[PDB]
Amino acid sequence: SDSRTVSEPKTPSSCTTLKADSSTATSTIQKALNNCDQGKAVRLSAGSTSVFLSGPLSLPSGVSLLIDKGVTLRAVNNAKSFENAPSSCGVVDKNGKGCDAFITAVSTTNSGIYGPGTIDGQGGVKLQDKKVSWWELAADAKVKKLKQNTPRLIQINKSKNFTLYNVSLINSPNFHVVFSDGDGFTAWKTTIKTPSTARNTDGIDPMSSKNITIAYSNIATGDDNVAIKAYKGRAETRNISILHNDFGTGHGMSIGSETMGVYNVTVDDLKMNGTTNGLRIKSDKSAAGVVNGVRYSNVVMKNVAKPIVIDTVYEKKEGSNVPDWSDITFKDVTSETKGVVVLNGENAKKPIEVTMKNVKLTSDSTWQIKNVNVKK
Prior knowledge:
This protein is mostly beta strands. The protein has a single domain, classed as Pectate Lyase C-like, CATH 2.160.20. The protein has helices spanning 26-33, 136-144, and strands spanning 14-19, 41-45, 51-54, 57-58, 64-67, 72-75, 92-93, 103-106, 112-114, 118-120, 147-148, 154-157, 160-170, 177-180, 183-193, 204-207, 210-215, 218-220, 226-230, 237-247, 253-259, 262-273, 277-282, 290-302, 306-311, 324-335, 340-344, 352-360, 366-370, 372-375. It has a 17-stranded parallel β-sheet that branches. The chain has an 11-stranded parallel β-sheet with strand order 4-8-12-14-16-19-21-23-25-27-29. A two-stranded antiparallel sheet has the order 7-11. Strand 1 (14-19), helix 1 and strand 2 form a beta-alpha-beta unit. The chain is globular and about 60 Å long. It starts with 13 loop residues before the first strand and ends with a strand. GO terms for molecular function: polygalacturonase activity. InterPro entries: GH28_Enzymes, Glyco_hydro_28, Pectin_lyas_fold, Pectin_lyase_fold/virulence. Belongs to the glycosyl hydrolase 28 family.
């Protein structure tokens, strides 16, 4: 659980109010963000249109963005607009870091993004610049075994007490929300909706960060609904609360594949419908590390193919990293439809010990166990 006391966010008062028209809004919004009083927000309201069309924006420390009901902040469908180097974006190669995110918050304290407007990434729209859309680059990347360069919606780095509240995030070209190398992130009443077939669209991913709360939110996307990660040479990921949520399509409430120190994760009251994986802890030989103190409770799943997944050899990658996963508990977890539980502890020195209290799976469900002991 998050070590902070976290209560429902309050929306900041506006410093400036902008009205949408048919012109490109990037510099108009950036200028407003650059002269906004600490603790206030730039407010995006309707004008002649209700859509603010923009390229990359930077969110200053202590400043927030407020998007009105019915208003959309939409990412331009242009690869050159998001590049960080000549021709680095909207291509498939050995990079993967060729595009800036739509909204980036670097070294911020008390910054935030508020709705109930929408942020639309236009992931599935043909680019003005290329023959394909952002999502169409994944097939190519997968089949060619390389990396696509597409923009993330919200990228937060080295920040403190960032807030994401009462807002909708749709059609993200890449991951929707990333909170990296920081401390204090609260996502509350956050709605994420991206097609189940769109690859590389993780919902909310804390990366080597501490003190995270994801509550009263609704996440339906293509890849991981939530993916908790910790990287070698960076901070440990600790103290996380995932409470009172609803997950739709996606790859699950996951931890990994980068598991270099993930501690004290509390998941309670989670409704899942159609997610391909339910509760997951995954890694491989290239990024496995310590995962300790993970507790799942009051989880109800419907139409989830793999309700519980603990896999230490998810993909076959080279490396000598060994998973040291312990103190993992499941309590009051129900799966209403036929599915498979995968428990694989290959590459772990000793059998992974897991506790399952009142875990009810249908009678036609299968358990695939390898080097892991289940205590009841």
